[PDB]
Amino acid sequence: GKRVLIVDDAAFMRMMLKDIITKAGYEVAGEATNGREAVEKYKELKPDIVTMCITMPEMNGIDAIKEIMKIDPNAKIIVASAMGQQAMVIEAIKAGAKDFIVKPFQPSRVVEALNKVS
DSSP: OEEEEEEOOOHHHHHHHHHHHHTTOOOEEESSHHHHHHHHHHHHOOOSSEESSSOOSSSSSHHHHHHHHHHHHTOEEEEEEEOOHHHHHHHHTTTTTOOEEEEEEHHHHHHHHHHHOO
């Protein structure tokens, strides 16, 4: 399965990540702009992979990860963050995330994460 749900409050970031993901032969199944929409779209779409920004309004990334893991204990979540958020990324990993990618996105690394988690 190669359907990805992209979760990030920044349109810019969703666009750049989508470009990488599609260029790598994956499909973007949907987009969400905060944690609450992430959970709703996960239920709606049942994506193979979720990319999840840590820093987000209305519901942050770690809380959304916890919700999605309850909904689907087999979820595959890659956390996204800027540098300097290592402690938050570790917390997200302990809550169930399988890998991480750092902004600004390095295409080779994102591709590697997608293949690995698949």
